[PDB]
Amino acid sequence: TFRRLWPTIAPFKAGLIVAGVALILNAASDTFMLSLLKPLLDDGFGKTDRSVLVWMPLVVIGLMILRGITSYVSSYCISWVSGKVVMTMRRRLFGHMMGMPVSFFDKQSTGTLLSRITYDSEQVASSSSGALITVVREGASIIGLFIMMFYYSWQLSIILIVLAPIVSIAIRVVSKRFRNISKNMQNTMGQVTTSAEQMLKGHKEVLIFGGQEVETKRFDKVSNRMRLQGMKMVSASSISDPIIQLIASLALAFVLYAASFPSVMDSLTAGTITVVFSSMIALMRPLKSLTNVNAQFQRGMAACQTLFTILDSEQEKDEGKRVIERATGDVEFRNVTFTYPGRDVPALRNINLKIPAGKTVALVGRSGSGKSTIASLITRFYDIDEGEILMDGHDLREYTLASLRNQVALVSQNVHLFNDTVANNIAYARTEQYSREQIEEAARMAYAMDFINKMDNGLDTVIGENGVLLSGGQRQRIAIARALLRDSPILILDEATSALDTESERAIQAALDELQKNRTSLVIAHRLSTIEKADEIVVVEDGVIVERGTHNDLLEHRG
Amino acid sequence: TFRRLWPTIAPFKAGLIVAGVALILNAASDTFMLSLLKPLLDDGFGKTDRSVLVWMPLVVIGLMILRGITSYVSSYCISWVSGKVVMTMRRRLFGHMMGMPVSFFDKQSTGTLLSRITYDSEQVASSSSGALITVVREGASIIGLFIMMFYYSWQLSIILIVLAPIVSIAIRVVSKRFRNISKNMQNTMGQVTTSAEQMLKGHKEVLIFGGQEVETKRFDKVSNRMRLQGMKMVSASSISDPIIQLIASLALAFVLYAASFPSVMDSLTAGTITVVFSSMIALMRPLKSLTNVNAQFQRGMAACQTLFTILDSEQEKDEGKRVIERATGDVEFRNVTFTYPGRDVPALRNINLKIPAGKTVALVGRSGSGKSTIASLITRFYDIDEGEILMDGHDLREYTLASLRNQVALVSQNVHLFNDTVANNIAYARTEQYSREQIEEAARMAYAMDFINKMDNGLDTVIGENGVLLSGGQRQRIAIARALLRDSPILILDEATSALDTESERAIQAALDELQKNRTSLVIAHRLSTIEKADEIVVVEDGVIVERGTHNDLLEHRG
Numbered sequence A, B: 001t002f003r004r005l006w007p008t009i010a011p012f013k014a015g016l017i018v019a020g021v022a023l024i025l026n027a028a029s030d031t032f033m034l035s036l037l038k039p040l041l042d043d044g045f046g047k048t049d050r051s052v053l054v055w056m057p058l059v060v061i062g063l064m065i066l067r068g069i070t071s072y073v074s075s076y077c078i079s080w081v082s083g084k085v086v087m088t089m090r091r092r093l094f095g096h097m098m099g100m101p102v103s104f105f106d107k108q109s110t111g112t113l114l115s116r117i118t119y120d121s122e123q124v125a126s127s128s129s130g131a132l133i134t135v136v137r138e139g140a141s142i143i144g145l146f147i148m149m150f151y152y153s154w155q156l157s158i159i160l161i162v163l164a165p166i167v168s169i170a171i172r173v174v175s176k177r178f179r180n181i182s183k184n185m186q187n188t189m190g191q192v193t194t195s196a197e198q199m200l201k202g203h204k205e206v207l208i209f210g211g212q213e214v215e216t217k218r219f220d221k222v223s224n225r226m227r228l229q230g231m232k233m234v235s236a237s238s239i240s241d242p243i244i245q246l247i248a249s250l251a252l253a254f255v256l257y258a259a260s261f262p263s264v265m266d267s268l269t270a271g272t273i274t275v276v277f278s279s280m281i282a283l284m285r286p287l288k289s290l291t292n293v294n295a296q297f298q299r300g301m302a303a304c305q306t307l308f309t310i311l312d313s314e315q316e317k318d319e320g321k322r323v324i325e326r327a328t329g330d331v332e333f334r335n336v337t338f339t340y341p342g343r344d345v346p347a348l349r350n351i352n353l354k355i356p357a358g359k360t361v362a363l364v365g366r367s368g369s370g371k372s373t374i375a376s377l378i379t380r381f382y383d384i385d386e387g388e389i390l391m392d393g394h395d396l397r398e399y400t401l402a403s404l405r406n407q408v409a410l411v412s413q414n415v416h417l418f419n420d421t422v423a424n425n426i427a428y429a430r431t432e433q434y435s436r437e438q439i440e441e442a443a444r445m446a447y448a449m450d451f452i453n454k455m456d457n458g459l460d461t462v463i464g465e466n467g468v469l470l471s472g473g474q475r476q477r478i479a480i481a482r483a484l485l486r487d488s489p490i491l492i493l494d495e496a497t498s499a500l501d502t503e504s505e506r507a508i509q510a511a512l513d514e515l516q517k518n519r520t521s522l523v524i525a526h527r528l529s530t531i532e533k534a535d536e537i538v539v540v541e542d543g544v545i546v547e548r549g550t551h552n553d554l555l556e557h558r559g
Helices: A014-018 A024-035 A037-047 A056-096 A102-108 A112-126 A130-137 A139-152 A154-201 A212-258 A270-290 A297-310 A373-379 A401-407 A422-426 A436-445 A449-453 A472-486 A504-517 A528-533 B006-012 B014-035 B037-044 B051-077 B087-097 B119-125 B129-152 B154-201 B213-258 B270-290 B293-297 B301-311 B401-407 B422-426 B436-445 B449-454 B472-484 B504-517 B528-532
Strands: A331-339 A346-348 A360-363 A386-391 A408-411 A490-493 A520-524 B331-334 B352-355 B360-363 B389-391 B490-493 B520-524 B539-541 B544-547
Touching (some): A014 A056, A024 A037, A024 A056, A024 A130, A024 A139, A024 A270, A037 A056, A037 B270, A056 A130, A056 B213, A112 B154, A130 A139, A130 A270, A130 A297, A139 A154, A139 A270, A154 A212, A154 B087, A212 A270, A212 B051, A212 B087, A270 B270, A346 A373, A360 A528, A373 A408, A373 A490, A373 A520, A408 A472, A422 A436, A422 A472, A436 A449, A436 A472, A472 A504, A490 A504, A504 A520, A504 A528, B014 B129, B037 B051, B087 B119, B119 B301, B129 B154, B129 B270, B154 B213, B154 B270, B213 B270, B422 B436, B422 B472, B436 B472, B472 B504, B504 B520, B504 B528
Parallel strands (some): A360 A520, A408 A490, A490 A520, B490 B520
Antiparallel strands (some): A331 A346, B331 B352, B331 B389, B539 B544
């Protein structure tokens, strides 16, 4: 559809104006070097022996150099525009693809968003610039060749002028029919594609009931209608072209029949008719692509709408005003009722959970009904429907988002590490605020000094590209060292650690002893020792607090 | 890298030797339709004549009819070899790909499995058949046009054949340099795509930190590098074209200077010189492709080499011959030593564990070591390293794989449903052995009658993905109904989720109680009522049996 896109190319228009003087030159050079077909035959190899046959070959050489150099300039400057738009679109999306809440990143898409940064944004300028190369370097060949016709042989050019709309709407209708057939058949191809994934995700339960022979018997019928539909796909694709040339041949027939009548004879020399009937052979490529511009200018921008919607899809709400510096004060929950987006069950009911300042609450129960969510409302990953989450006597909504998240530090075995150095992975963000010395002492206080110094460079190894690929407990330890460097006043540990820890449980426990000597800890917990050590165990499941009592009374219910 | 695919393509030779004569004809028809230029510019508009102008258009149609319907035949009858060789690869793979053990599916190759059936296989005949299209058509166009030039003008055709290798090797070397550049540029683009994926995947941690201006800056830098390497992509791609046309223009000047170098030359009429030159403007299309045949045919079979490897990978071993009808006898684990495939850390220690006849033994402890693992070896998913597993006085190596897994019916929350109808979903691979009345009895006995009837078509409805869709508890119901349909003596059952139940758990426990009144059961325990309703308990965690005693002594450990 007609669109805007233009502010994103406006400062990069000096490369597009050069694409208005380097692609017209391309058609001008493949036309003028088709205009040399009349001196070469009429005068060169006809009337005269030579002395125009020696002027011409240098002029061809020069004419192709003119094509080639300006073809390179065209394909370079159009690509410069397409690169400083693809770059400008990827960056603007990525700046908008980090302000959106966690709601959109889960559920809605997992890997599509790399398609909408790598593939879909590549196709914005790979099929809209291809629709601007075509509309000039083959959209000017039409004008140049028609000017050739009018200049050389005007009298038969009128009939081909009447002819072009006819050939044009013929291309349009056959292309429309082919597009219709392919568009109907591709979805049915996709269904039989999903059949294989059904049979291949479930190697278990296809193998546990001995259904291999039956599944092959059915996949026979699936492959058959996979291939019989691609048959009609390729047949419809390859029946258009022959029809296209057939109609174009029907022209070379009409103009040739017109060339039989005496009226036109005596007005065409040896070179003129050749320039003409060569120009026609040439007209069949540009036209074929000029009427297909709306098949690329549309499809490219039709795909571009997907990334133009996420660009305007609303970010995560930031109406906060107060920049909390440090919140060692009490954490409180007040009638906190919340539902996950795209669901219906109220995950949390009316809940009150007064955390003491510096004491750790243990959240027992693996049913996962309001368990994992309870920290998410603190981090504001998912927002709050009803209630009030008091931090230092104000709701989280009042505080600024950045300051809020600065206070809390999510520490879990499944902490995702980055492509940087280990030292800056620890001191990620505010790299000027924290020196290397403080990072090293934090690694000491985390019992993580070993895992950093064990490596070759030690201080600044690459952690990204599986330089060490630290294990789950080790990533837990690097996350602790992150927290100790940050001194995050409120901690939330998921504590998904369930694998055996060869004194990395001792490391973890001494670590959280440091983390919870001061600073709060709303810890989802599995390790029963720390749970018993928790000062106020609060098992919370089924949307409500099951109990607010320590392990002296946790044996009630599951225990 | 030479063929081999010939056995799989051989019986569909009728389409190949029809496409071969429907492409040599296609080349010869163009060739003959340029040859026709000489009558039109030597006999028609040279010496005055109209008789050679009335039949001309007619022999341009019929020649164009010949191209058109010959191109259609070639594109169809070559798609009939490229259809029955992409299909014959998919069937043979998927019939072999259900043979390889579940070890290969999990964490060795999981998401690429669909690609090597859908994507890769199509590129084994979409670019190796392109060789046959562009080594017969455009490979015979060269021969036809050279024959034309010999028939018309030997004097410059000899030097044309002298230069043809020069243009050809020039194209080869320039394309080689382009390919070499593009390989490294592709590598860089992929690496930076992974860098972006790192940022996006960790959005939870990339929010809980302070502020995303640092990561926006890094993304700006690496997007700049993407664009700066796309610059080199396009530059290498667009130096090739102008270089090829420039060299060919060197010949479009060498022969033209030879046309004036001796007094012998210039004896070529307007028709002959037009036929020759035009023939040359033409040769510049087939050559560009004949020199790049190995660029596609070796980018063809090379992918088919991967498909040949996955075709020739070792399917799961079956050597036993005892076709057990029913595992009534007790089953024993005896000092089983085994580790997960792809990994070398041992998972199972020497364990002596017997299943009593018609009774159940449960597994406790969420360490994940030897509970989901030990559930697999009874079904012979991963074979033992050492330590015989005994069923009814025999061993796993002794039994037939199909008969061995016939016994074990697996019930789990993560059970996957085939996209067939429910009547064959329950009785899958057993359609002839069961009557429909039996599945209605099985549905009401399993208490799945509610889920069956609540659907619109109900008894005969569709159930899988791309169907009516179901929830996890209903998946447990369809699985217990699956098991209840006759043979399930050695029950392996998940019971690992403990999802909330709206009296569903009463139905699950009652149905599995009916199924366990006879028939043995190994249950991973999450619901402790079944632990209480257990003949024996063997808490398995930290890689070994910890206590093979009932719930009277289980509370000594975690509980």
